[PDB]
Every structure is written in C-alpha cells, then in structure tokens.
Design a protein around this ligand. Structure first.
Ligand SMILES: *[C@H]1OC[C@@H](O[C@@H]2OC[C@@H](O)[C@H](O)[C@H]2O)[C@H](O)[C@H]1O
Ligand SMILES: *[C@H]1OC[C@@H](O[C@@H]2OC[C@@H](O)[C@H](O)[C@H]2O)[C@H](O)[C@H]1O
Lengths: 427, 427
C-alpha cells in the first residue's frame, strides 16, 4: 500500500508514527487521522515518570494503558517514553538525591518496564541528558548528581527488566554533526558499545526551527551512529512552518540509512502540537493534509509551466495581468512570465514572484485565480504523483471547466475524478 | 503628527478610525493601541438596535455609552452604527411587520439619536439594505416589506432627530463599480438627492478578500457618488492577509477623493476581528504593527540591494549560501543573487526566491539569518522612511554588530537607535 504514511514506510520495513495524547482519543477527527496514517505510537506524556509513578512506589498506568491499548488495537507498535530523565519528574523524585535517588530511578525503571514487559518495540530509557552550553558535557540534574554512571546503570537495569525491547538514548540538538552536544552523545554511545553497555538505539528528537535548523549533515550524523552498531530513530519530528522540502529531506535521510527504524512526528494536527504557533506538523487544525504531507508520502514511495494533459495547454494568467481576482485559464504554451509557476516550500504556486494561485472558496465550481500571497490554506496546493493538483483547504482538484481544452478555458476547483482535465505535467 | 494613523490622516483633513468593542476595553494592550492610533470610533455592536432598545420603547445606552465615553475621553469623534437595518434586531422587532414595524423603526431612530443628539459625527441611518442576488434591488427583510419608502422615511426621521449629524447609507459589495448592487445604491442616492431626501454620505464597508477582491475602479465608484453631492466614507475596512499594496491602494483611493471623509478599519488587532482567520487588520495578536500598518501610514503621509548607511556595504548572504541558519552580513555591493532582496506584500525580505530574512529570537543580539519562508512574524519587516528596518515580532532594528563597516560584519537585531549602522537605503 502507498496511500498512507505508515503503509508507505512499511514498504521499506520502516514505520511512520506520531505522538498520541490520551485526552484526544475521544476526538473522532483526531482518531480518524491517527488510526489511518500511522503504524507506530509514542504516548505524548502518559508513560513519563510523573504519569506512571505519581507517588514514590505508587504506580498508575490508567493513561499509559489507554494509549498503549489504542495503539495495538489499531495496528501500531509502541515506543515507550521515557524511563529516566530530569524532566517532568513527580514532586517526590525532584527532592531526592544521592543513592536514594539512584535507587528510586532503578525502581521506576523496573516498575514501568515490568508492566509493559515484552509489548514495547523501543524504550527511551534515558533522554535529554546532555547540555546545550556548548561543552558537549552532561546536563546538571539531580540524576547526574548521583554519579556520571547513572545513564549506564539505567540501561543495564532496563535490559534486565525487558530483554525484548530495543533500548534507546534520546536527545535533541544532536542532529547537526558539527555541534558539541552531538559529539558528546556520539562519544558516550561509542564508549557504551565498546564496553558492552546494553544500548540498541539512539533517538533524535529532530525539533527543527530557525533557532536550531535542519542541516543536510543530519544524514551524516545518523550514518555515523549507525556505523557504531546501533539503530537510529527520528523520535519527535516537527518542522517550523512545515517546509515541504525540509520534511522530504528528513524523510529521505531516514530512508538513506539502513538502520533508521522509522520516523515519528510529534503530534497529529498543528492544533495538537506542543508548538502549535510554529504549525510544524503534517495536518492542519481542520484535519486537512498539508503540502508537507504529500512531500513526505512521495518520499516514502520512492519519489516552470504547468501543462494540462487533456488540453495540451498551459496554466495561464490572462493577458499577463497582475490584478488580484483574475481567474486563470488554459492557453497555448509559450515563453512568458504569466505561464511560469513556482512551487514553494509553503505549498504555494507563485507567479510574478508575489502572486499566488488562489481558490475563491471551497466548493465545486470555485473560481481559481491569482491573488496576493498571504499564507491562506486556499493558496496552498498538493502536487500528486498522478498529476492532480489538490487545494489544501478545499480538498478539491484544479479543474479545466467542463473539460474544455481551447484557449480561454477557465480553471476551477472540482471533486477529483482522475479526469484528463484535472491532470497536469510540470516542465 | 505623522507617527500615528489618525494624526497622519489629519494632515489631509481626514480621520482614521476603528471599531471598538466595549468588552475589550479592560485589555490594556487593546486600549493602548486604540487610543494612540485612531481619532474616530465606531461601536462594533453597542449602538445597534438590540443593544439600544432591548424591549419596545425601553431604551438602554449602558453599552453604547461605555464606547462613547471611552472615545471622547481619548479625543476621538464617533460614528453611530446602525439605526435601521435587517440584522441584529431584538426579538420584539423581528416579530413586527407593516405599519407597526414602520412606527417602531421611527421610534427607535428618535430614541437613539435623541440620546446622542449633537455628539455624533456620522450616523449609519440604514445599512445593508440591498441584495447580492445580482438584480441590484432591495434585500427582502421585514423593513423592506413595510414599503420601498422605508429607507427614505428613516433618513427624514434622522435629520429631524439630530440636524447636526451627517446621515449615511452604509453597505458592502458596493465598491466595485460594475456590480449591480453598486449601481442600485447609486440610483437610490441619486433619487434621494434629486427629491430632497436628507442624505449626506455613503459608507462603503470595504470588506475585501479573494472572494470579493478590491478593484481599482473603486476610485471611480467613490468619485461617482461624490458627484451626487454626498460625502463618502470607508467604514469597515479589512483586507484578507492584510496585503500592504492593497491597504495602500484603498487608502490612496480615499486620499484622491476630496469628499472622502476618512477610513475606519473594522477592528484593532487581528485577534479582535470578526474575521480573525483572515488576519485582515493592521496589528497582530501580540499588538505589533504589521507591514501593512507602515504601508498605510506611508500613504497617509504622502507616500534590489539593501545598502547600509555609513558602511556603504550591502546586506549579503555569505558565499551565496542557501543553507538555513546562515547569518547575513555586510559586503561590497555587486551584481550577485546572494544580495538582491525582494520586499513582499506580506512584509518579507526574500532572497533566492524562497528564502526569508529570518530572526532567530526576539532580544538584542538576536542573529539575523536566512530560513525557508513560512509566514512567521520573525520573518516580517517594516521599512521605515528614516531608513530603519524593524522586525515585526521583535520590534527591534536590523543592526550591523558593533557598528562594524568592513566585509564580514554580522547583522543582528538591536534596540532601534537611529544609528548609521541601523539605517539602510535602496538601491
Ligand atoms: C521531546 O520534546 C517534546 C516532549 O514532549 C512534550 O513534553 C512537555 C509536555 O508538556 C508536552 O505536552 C509534550 O509534547 C518529549 O517528552 C521530549 O522527549
Ligand atoms: C459591517 O460588517 C460587520 C458588522 O459588524 C459585525 O456584526 C456582527 C457581529 O457579530 C460582529 O461582532 C460585528 O463585528 C457591521 O455591523 C456591518 O455594518
């Protein structure tokens, strides 16, 4: 299969997952998308320390089990997150220190993994243990204060608790190979593999934004870790603005690494994101597939003028007008700026540099025209492999009215039918 | 004098107003912006029929006076809206028809205008009375069903109630001259003037979006009505996406017509808008001035490479790199693509076509770099006449670190100081 992300990833033995929030499982729109598109699930918060052990020695898996059960019942594997780290610790653990904390860490690992023994594909045993100060050293936390060997102990503890799960070390800002933090983690994992410390995978948060941009060397980082004899996984992927090229680039980086088990995006819809202001996911708040969704799907499946297949004519702006509201048409192809369209990272089809292919509404018969670019979803489009061009907001296809093929035939939105008047070739 | 919208508009004897919502007056950010920028106020809902006459014969001005008092206390004039129309009628009026409704309409006009007698600059006596069906005729409402002369009667009643107020007929979709609706309204106003019916102005909602685009013939529309002997006013202006060129065009249309009294935008911040999803106003949710704000201010005030004054060097992307996160610098100006910036309608400074001048943060010293364009406010800039370039999200100026002038000098964000290292020209 290749119409959904998970199924597309499965073609190469990989998975495409998401972070599930138990509180959203009652949202039909949410579950419809999540059950259909992903085959791997990570509990967004339900399996963390405070959620699973609210009081010292008192475990609770009500929320964790609901996420786990929803996942397995809907055909998805699960990544456990997270067993031992400085963040979101319950009040009682935050106050602990020394051997007492070290013992509480061990007890927590045994309790949680024991509850889910043999049912978890991957466990983020330790996460966010390194600093961002630029030294490439450990983060100063109550756990780190118990001794530099706490991470190694956590992993040894984890292996014994559940030998069937892949044990991962997860962190962020370790994607760019030139960063000190990336090197610090690399050296630790290398040391671990050399000394025989039980670690099977390294998780890369992959939280990209202009403050910590994606860089092509992320593939090199993944390959360098894979060379150490550990699998790698993109664990919390989200990209500020959801650039189509960047999402495709990250997807292809995993596909280029044999040991990359799969990719998980941190959330379903932008409105479900912990960073919603950055609209960093693959689905909009209304549940519509974004331009980035198609870019990712295309990559997973192994994937100028815009000419209509049925007419042989090009998408044209009448008389090279730059007036907002000018409906586009079909016209004999020729070298002119009013027939030169540029597909942007945001999913727009631009002309003249700052004018956007624009849908004047959302239903069948909607006029498609040029309008000043401003970021509306009615100005975003998905370029499908079959040649159809679908409006993000409407979910409708660019359509040459009535199947017309002569010069002057107007363009509208219309239910996709795979008709020749809805298929386009880019040159 | 020329630093705020109202003051700039006053330089041509006009006003620049907004719609005020009484329920938002407790918001310090809201009132700070509103009090500072506008010299005309329209109550968004507080002076409508249901808000001023909750029961037949029982008037209530608690809501209206809160808006009125705030306006006068802050030096603004007031546009009354709206006395007789089909929308937002209280239940008791919705139940009326024929002569009973006709008298209730007259009583309402007398009651409300009497309360505000002599304190209102303009009153939208009747609003939204024409149909959008293309016939150019009247909208079917209980008022229209009382007789075609209801509008005339409303105006005659209003003149007698308060001879000091300018009486306006307000409507939408009457901006494009070619529309039947526009001409139907024109015919009515012409008839009124010819027969001596008291009408002093025509208000144009000016609600523009790709579904009902702004058209340059709007200036001829304004001119046509002005020639009838009535003033004109842009009453509820908002533009989808807040296109800078469109906002400037509309502003210039009013500035070109001597009888255009002024412009009112329908709201303060995008988040306050009745159509917030179209981010159609001049201020963002966090209260920052958008690129469109500067476009309007510039227009009211009379109306490639980016060289730094003093250094004489141009904004340059190091080694013509296209890598996200590359900090920009100053460098000898030369015909190169890694220079050549394009200011878009959305307020971006683009390079390479799809890369955006990007601020990785909001404080002083913030790195200014290139990043994929996605619409973030940290990618929007305002080009001031003094030569400064201010980041919309940060409110800080593009700054050449340490006042450096040699090649390699990095660009950052920094509190505006009018220094030569924060002044740019184009070129
Ligand atoms: C990676 O970063 C995202 C983390 O998830 C968030 O943690 C804080 C919660 O408030 C938020 O809802 C979560 O999405 C995740 O645990 C890290 O590993
Ligand atoms: C012009 O259009 C906007 C109208 O104002 C809105 O009316 C409906 C309310 O729910 C909304 O809050 C208002 O902004 C105005 O009255 C018309 O003249």
């Amino acid at each position: 299969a290749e119409s959904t992300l998970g199924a597309a990833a499965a073609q190469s033995g990989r998975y495409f997952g998401t972070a599930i929030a138990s509180g959203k499982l009652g949202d039909s729109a949410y579950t419809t998308i999540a059950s259909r598109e992903f085959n791997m699930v990570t509990a967004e918060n339900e399996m963390k320390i405070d959620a699973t052990e609210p009081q010292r020695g008192q475990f609770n898996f009500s929320a964790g089990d609901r996420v786990y059960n929803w996942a397995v019942q809907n055909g998805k594997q699960v990544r456990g997150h997270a067993l031992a780290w400085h963040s979101q610790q319950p009040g009682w653990m935050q106050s602990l220190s020394g051997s007492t904390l070290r013992q509480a860490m061990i007890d927590h690992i045994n309790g949680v993994m024991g509850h889910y023994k043999g049912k978890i594909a991957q466990w983020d045993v330790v996460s966010h243990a390194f600093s961002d100060d630029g030294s490439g050293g450990r983060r100063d936390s109550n756990l780190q204060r118990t001794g530099n060997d706490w991470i190694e102990v956590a992993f040894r503890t984890a292996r014994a608790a559940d030998p069937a799960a892949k044990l991962c070390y997860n962190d962020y800002n370790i994607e760019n190979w030139t960063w000190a933090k990336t090197q610090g983690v690399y050296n630790m994992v290398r040391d671990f593999k050399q000394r025989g410390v039980p670690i099977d995978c390294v998780g890369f948060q992959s939280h990209f934004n202009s403050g910590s941009p994606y860089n092509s060397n992320f593939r090199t980082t993944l390959q360098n870790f894979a060379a150490l004899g550990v699998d790698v996984a993109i664990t919390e992927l989200d990209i500020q603005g959801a650039s189509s090229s960047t999402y495709a680039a990250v997807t292809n980086d995993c596909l280029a690494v044999s040991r990359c088990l799969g990719i998980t995006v941190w959330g379903v819809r932008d409105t479900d994101s912990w960073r919603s202001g950055d609209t960093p996911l693959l689905f909009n708040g209304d549940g519509s597939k974004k331009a980035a969704y198609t870019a990712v799907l295309n990559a997973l499946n192994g994937g100028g003028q815009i000419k209509g297949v049925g007419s042989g004519r090009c998408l044209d702006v009448p008389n090279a007008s730059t007036t907002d509201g000018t409906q586009v048409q079909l016209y004999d192809c020729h070298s002119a700026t009013n027939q030169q369209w540029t597909y942007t990272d945001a999913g727009e089809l631009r002309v003249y540099g700052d004018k956007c292919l624009d849908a004047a509404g959302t239903g069948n018969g909607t006029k498609v025209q040029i309008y000043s670019c401003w970021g509306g979803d009615n100005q975003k489009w998905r370029l499908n492999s079959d040649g159809s061009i679908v409006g993000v907001q409407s979910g409708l296809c660019l359509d040459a009215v009535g199947g017309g093929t002569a010069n002057g035939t107007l363009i509208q939105l219309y239910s996709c039918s795979n008709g020749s008047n809805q298929r386009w070739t880019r040159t």
